[PDB]
């Protein structure tokens, strides 16, 4: 089956920061876009952050343009999140997911295809 | 909900015809128009690609016919031209002091040759091969050519033998190259590679046997363009060569007389030691050897139980009834009856050659040349690569037809095909312009 | 390499766009055949630019696939075809393609024009 | 159809230009006219992407019209004037609109390039 | 003039590349002098046009200055030397740079494709 | 009727006509044709 | 009215017995000497 299994930090104090390593196997990494997405504890999904299949590319929502940068390395199938300024409204469960982006030769997703289990940022 | 998208440098070609560009790494070949060939050149392996090649419809072939005749031709323009040689000659036969079996073959012929001056004439005697020259009725005789074309006389400076020549693509254009092992001449080929040149083809001239050619990777391989079809021939590629030792054993003796401003008119002068006869070597055991793989492969096409005879060509000019070669300077026609004289159902061999100076090549008419004599004794050790067969019931005959130079040419040009690259093509991405 | 790309599928080959277009350009009879590559050359050019694509290898377009043309799937022609199975498949539509092209294009410079021409 | 908009006013005849650029490009003796014709097609091309319209057929520029090389207005250019005829009326001012052209197209690279310098 | 900013600084001759530009394209043997030079004029705006440079004089790219190439200072490179010196310098580093700039304008096409493909 | 300068006399006149005139010429002697060789490769064709 | 153009504070090193126009020159003096010789007669029946 595809499997993600994220790995990252705890309890980091207000303004400081973190970065999130997700492992993905199952399927080849390369031919799928790669997007994180926010759940507080007390609230739904929200779509945090977006890169393609080659990591040429990303998009993040307007209010962390500033905080959060995506990347993602094709050849050690790992897709890794560093956040800096860590700010009280961020904490909340970060989830992997396979989707929402195709390279134009592809059809089109606009969706996610896989969910991993999901790292817990706090502050 | 897809869009057309414009790509430029796509791996898209087609089949064309177009100019190749001739490459080499004094000599009638060499040509200082030929570019520097690449000392490392790189060859492309295409893998998944299948491509249908055909060996008779290959433009390359009549490119390299076209310029092979021209070079030819541009190397025999700036050298003496016999025209004062057409005159009558009174020839009684050379008649050496020891009796040879070969009276007649050589005649010594007197004859009034002009020189420097307009207002005298040299007396010469010459030597000329039986085959030069033709009796009008010592005896008269004229040169077997003076009832049909003027005599160029080939620069005595110019070497004749084989160079190889690479054809390379012109920009836009691209050579594939085959590589399918035991590829027939036709079909889907499965192996192809491009090249930006092709190897190194010795342009050889020769009738029947093929010489100094490329050898089937695995097994003989025979080609032909319809071989059910008598009208067309049938070129074998041998996987081992045949060496045959190729001789003119006697030691000739050239004498060279000015016949005008600037020209010299080199002639045949004597014959030192005795008169022995050209000839060629071919082991027994080896031909044996290579007739019995050809009949295998023969019998693989018209029937594992019928018989595959081999014979001697039926007649017509010399060029084609002989196996005609140029070797050492000298230009070689050898019987080759005792090669194939054999019926195949369900230590060495000596062929004699006779040597000609006046040859018509390219199967032209009205267009002779002059080989000057070769001093001394020449000797050739050659490899035949290949056979050009003919065809004519339970039995089959099959004789060495010949002639066409373009065979031969075929059969090292039956791996290459020249195709135009199409760079732009469409394709329905989604992707929309601003 | 030039053509390595042949036989790989329509993905995997428009990555290597640039070997082959340097290859395109990298006595009589020769000077012919040099003037004669270098006016296809310039023919492909100017057909590109005429399309509005003369200084791109992909180029982006607003003609839409109309699927008469073809009604295969985008993973069955990037994916499973080569560019040498493409171009036999829509052979017979290459023209009615460069035409729509060229009058999108020839729209799109007006509606440029006229959109520089606003105040 | 090629030339066919030559007796047209500027404007009709400003929707064909694909036509005639289609069609400019489209021994010895024959040798050095094709060669020539590929040399001032070039010089054309060249031309244009000097004034930063290399890929266009309409290019629109900063270069403002002096009045003094035709003082017409547009009604009278575009609806009731042909292009031979305006050709042959600012035949004498092409070389100073090219050279403006030319000095404005350096002097946008030069600007476009310290816009592109501010961090 | 012609080749006038020659021994001139790279920063002042960097403003008359138009004249050297217009001046690049201005029997057998003379055929194919000129054949041979449309090629080379060709190869040029060619290999531009691969680095996405197609239209311009002066073209930013994306490659970054590897400072082993040169260490210079840019005021060492524009005010205090000459293009020949420049030239002369980087002559063992120009199939590196230019390797880098058709990588990335792969890249960039790449990329540029796959962010009109969001709808 | 086309002419450079019509009052000229140096410049001839070029006469179009919008009907044509039949004109039917004829070499009504049966020549016979012999050929002799000359040279190598080269023949003389004349009337016999 | 052929234009020069002066260039300032270039130095270039020249060599003049290493110059591919004195070969080109002499190919081209060669070339229209003969092309004016062959339209000539060719005076063969003096060699008497
Ligand atoms: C097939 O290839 C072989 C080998 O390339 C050809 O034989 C070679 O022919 C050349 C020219 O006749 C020989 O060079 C000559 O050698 C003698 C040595 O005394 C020298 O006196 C001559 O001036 C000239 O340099 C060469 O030695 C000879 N090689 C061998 C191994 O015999 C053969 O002729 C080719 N076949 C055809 C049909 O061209
Ligand atoms: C060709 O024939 C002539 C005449 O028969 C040969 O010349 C003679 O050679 C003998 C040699 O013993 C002399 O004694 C005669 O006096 C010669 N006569 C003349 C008229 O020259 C000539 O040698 C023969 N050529 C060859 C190559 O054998
Ligand atoms: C050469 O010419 C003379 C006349 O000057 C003639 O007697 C003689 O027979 C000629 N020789 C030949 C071989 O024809
Ligand atoms: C002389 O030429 C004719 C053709 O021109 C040919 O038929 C004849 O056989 C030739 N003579 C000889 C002896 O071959
Ligand atoms: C094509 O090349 C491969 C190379 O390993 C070879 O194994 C294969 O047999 C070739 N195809 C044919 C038809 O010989
Ligand atoms: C003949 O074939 C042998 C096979 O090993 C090769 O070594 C030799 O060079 C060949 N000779 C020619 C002239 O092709
Ligand atoms: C040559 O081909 C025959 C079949 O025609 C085969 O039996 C023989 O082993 C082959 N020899 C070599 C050296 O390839
Ligand atoms: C060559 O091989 C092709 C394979 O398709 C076959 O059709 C053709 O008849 C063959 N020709 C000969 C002469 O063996
Ligand atoms: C091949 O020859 C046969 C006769 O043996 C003929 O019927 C057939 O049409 C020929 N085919 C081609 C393609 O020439
Ligand atoms: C041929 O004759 C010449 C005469 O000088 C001699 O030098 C040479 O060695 C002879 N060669 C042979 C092979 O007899
Ligand atoms: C050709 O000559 C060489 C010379 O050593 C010899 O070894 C070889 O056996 C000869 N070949 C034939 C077929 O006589
Ligand atoms: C060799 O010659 C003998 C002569 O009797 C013949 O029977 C045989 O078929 C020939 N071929 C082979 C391969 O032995
Ligand atoms: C001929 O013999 C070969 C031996 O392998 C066999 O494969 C082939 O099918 C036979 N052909 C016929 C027509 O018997
Ligand atoms: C080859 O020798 C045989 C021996 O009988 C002869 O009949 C044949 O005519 C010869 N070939 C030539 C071309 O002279
Ligand atoms: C050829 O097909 C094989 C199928 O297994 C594939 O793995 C390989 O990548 C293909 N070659 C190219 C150049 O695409
Ligand atoms: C698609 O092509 C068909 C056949 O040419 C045509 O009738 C149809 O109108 C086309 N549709 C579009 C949207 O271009
Ligand atoms: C020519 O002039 C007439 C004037 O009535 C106009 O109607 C027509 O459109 C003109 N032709 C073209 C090709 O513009
Ligand atoms: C217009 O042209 C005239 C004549 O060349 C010139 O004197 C005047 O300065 C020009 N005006 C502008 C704004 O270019
Ligand atoms: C040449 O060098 C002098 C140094 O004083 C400088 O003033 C001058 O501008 C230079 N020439 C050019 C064309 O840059
Ligand atoms: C700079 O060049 C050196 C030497 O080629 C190379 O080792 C190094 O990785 C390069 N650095 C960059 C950033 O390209
Ligand atoms: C031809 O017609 C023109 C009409 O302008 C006239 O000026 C000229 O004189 C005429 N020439 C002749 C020879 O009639
Ligand atoms: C035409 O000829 C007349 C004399 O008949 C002459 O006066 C006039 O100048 C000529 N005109 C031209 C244009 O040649
Ligand atoms: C001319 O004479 C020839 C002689 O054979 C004859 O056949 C032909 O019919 C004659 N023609 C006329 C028109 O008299």
């Known amino acids: 089956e595809v499997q993600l299994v994220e790995t990252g930090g705890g309890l980091v104090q207000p303004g400081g920061s973190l970065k999130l390593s997700c492992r993905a196997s199952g399927y080849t990494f390369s031919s799928f876009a790669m997007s994180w997405v926010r759940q507080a504890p007390g609230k739904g999904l929200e779509w945090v952050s977006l890169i393609n299949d080659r990591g040429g590319l990303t998009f993040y929502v307007d209010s962390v343009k500033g905080r959060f940068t995506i990347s993602r390395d094709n050849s050690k199938n790992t897709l890794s999140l560093q956040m800096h300024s860590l700010r009280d409204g961020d904490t909340a469960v970060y989830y992997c997911?396979?989707?929402?982006?195709?390279?134009?030769?592809?059809?089109?997703?606009?969706?996610?295809?896989?969910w991993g289990q999901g790292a817990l940022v706090t502050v | 909900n897809l869009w057309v998208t414009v790509y430029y440098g796509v791996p898209v070609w087609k089949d064309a015809e177009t100019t190749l560009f001739c490459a080499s790494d004094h000599n009638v070949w060499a040509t200082h128009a030929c570019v520097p060939t690449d000392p490392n050149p790189q060859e492309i392996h295409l893998e998944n690609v299948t491509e249908e090649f055909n060996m008779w419809k290959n433009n390359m072939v009549e490119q390299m016919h076209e310029d092979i005749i021209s070079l030819w031709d541009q190397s025999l323009k700036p050298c003496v031209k016999l025209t004062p040689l057409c005159v009558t000659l009174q020839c009684t036969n050379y008649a050496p002091k020891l009796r040879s079996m070969m009276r007649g073959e050589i005649k010594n012929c007197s004859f009034n040759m002009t020189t420097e001056l307009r207002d005298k004439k040299q007396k010469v005697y010459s030597l000329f091969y039986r085959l030069d020259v033709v009796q009008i009725n010592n005896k008269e005789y004229r040169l077997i050519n003076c009832n049909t074309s003027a005599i160029t006389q080939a620069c005595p400076k110019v070497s004749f033998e084989p160079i190889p020549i690479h054809y390379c693509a012109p920009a836009g254009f691209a050579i594939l190259k085959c590589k399918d092992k035991k590829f027939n001449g036709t079909g889907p080929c499965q192996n192809v590679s491009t090249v930006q040149c092709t190897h190194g083809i010795k342009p050889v001239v020769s009738t029947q046997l093929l010489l100094n050619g490329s050898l089937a990777e695995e097994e003989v391989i025979i080609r032909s363009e319809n071989i059910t079809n008598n009208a067309k021939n049938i070129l074998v590629q041998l996987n081992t060569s045949v060496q045959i030792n190729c001789t003119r054993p006697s030691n000739n003796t050239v004498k060279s007389i000015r016949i005008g401003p600037g020209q010299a008119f080199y002639y045949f002068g004597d014959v030192l030691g005795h008169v022995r006869m050209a000839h060629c070597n071919i082991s027994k055991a080896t031909w044996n050897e290579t007739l019995g793989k050809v009949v295998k492969q023969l019998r693989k096409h018209f029937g594992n139980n019928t018989i595959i005879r081999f014979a001697q060509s039926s007649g017509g000019d010399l060029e084609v009834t002989t196996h005609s070669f140029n070797c050492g300077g000298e230009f070689f026609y050898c019987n080759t009856s005792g090669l194939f004289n054999s019926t195949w159902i369900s230590d060495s061999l000596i062929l004699p050659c006779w040597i000609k100076q006046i040859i018509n090549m390219w199967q032209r008419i009205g267009q002779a040349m002059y080989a000057p004599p070769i001093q001394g004794v020449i000797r050739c050790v050659s490899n035949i690569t290949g056979l050009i067969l003919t065809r004519d019931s339970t039995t089959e005959t099959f004789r060495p037809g010949g002639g066409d130079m373009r065979d031969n040419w075929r059969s090292e040009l039956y791996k290459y095909k020249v195709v135009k690259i199409e760079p732009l093509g469409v394709a329905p991405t989604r992707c929309k312009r601003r | 390499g030039f053509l390595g790309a042949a036989g790989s599928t329509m993905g995997a080959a428009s990555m290597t766009l640039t070997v082959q277009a340097r290859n395109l350009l990298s006595g009589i009879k020769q000077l012919q055949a040099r003037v004669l590559a270098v006016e296809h050359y310039l023919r492909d050019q100017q057909l590109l630019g005429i399309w509005g694509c003369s200084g791109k290898l992909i180029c982006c377009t607003n003609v839409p696939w109309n699927s008469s043309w073809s009604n295969r799937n985008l993973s069955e022609i990037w994916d499973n075809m080569t560019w040498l199975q493409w171009d036999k498949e829509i052979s017979n539509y290459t023209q009615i393609i460069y035409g729509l092209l060229e009058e999108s294009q020839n729209q799109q410079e007006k509606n440029e024009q006229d959109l520089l021409a606003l105040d | 159809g090629f030339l066919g908009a030559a007796g047209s006013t500027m404007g009709a005849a400003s929707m064909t230009l694909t036509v005639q650029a289609r069609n400019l490009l489209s021994g010895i003796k024959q040798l050095q006219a094709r060669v020539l014709a590929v040399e001032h097609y070039l010089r054309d091309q060249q031309l244009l992407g000097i004034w930063g319209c290399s890929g266009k057929l309409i290019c629109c520029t900063n270069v403002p019209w002096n009045s003094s090389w035709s003082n017409r207005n547009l009604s009278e250019i575009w609806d009731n004037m042909t292009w031979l005829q305006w050709d042959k009326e600012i035949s004498n001012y092409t070389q100073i609109i090219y050279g403006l052209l030319e000095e404005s197209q350096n002097q946008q690279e030069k600007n476009e390039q310290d816009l592109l310098a501010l961090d | 003039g012609f080749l006038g900013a020659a021994g001139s600084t790279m920063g002042a001759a960097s403003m008359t590349l138009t004249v050297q530009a217009r001046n690049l394209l201005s029997g057998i043997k003379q055929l194919q002098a000129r054949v041979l030079a449309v090629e080379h004029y060709l190869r040029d705006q060619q290999l531009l046009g691969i680095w996405g440079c197609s239209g311009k004089l002066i073209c930013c790219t994306n490659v970054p200055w590897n400072s082993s190439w040169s260490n210079r200072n840019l005021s060492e490179i524009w005010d205090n030397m000459t293009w020949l010196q420049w030239d002369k310098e980087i002559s063992n580093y120009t199939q590196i740079i230019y390797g880098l700039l058709e990588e990335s304008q792969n890249q960039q096409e790449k990329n540029e494709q796959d962010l009109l493909a969001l709808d | 009727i086309r002419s450079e300068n019509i009052t000229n006399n140096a410049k001839n006149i070029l006469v179009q006509l919008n009907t044509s005139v039949q004109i039917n010429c004829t070499r009504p002697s049966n020549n016979t044709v012999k050929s002799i060789r000359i040279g190598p490769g080269q023949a003389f064709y004349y009337f016999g | 009215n052929p234009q020069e153009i002066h260039l300032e504070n270039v130095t270039e090193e020249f060599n003049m017995w290493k110059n591919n126009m004195v070969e080109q020159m002499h190919e081209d003096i060669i070339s229209l000497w003969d092309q004016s010789l062959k339209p000539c007669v060719k005076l063969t029946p003096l060699c008497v």
């Open positions: 997911a396979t989707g929402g982006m195709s390279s134009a030769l592809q059809s089109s997703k606009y969706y996610f295809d896989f």
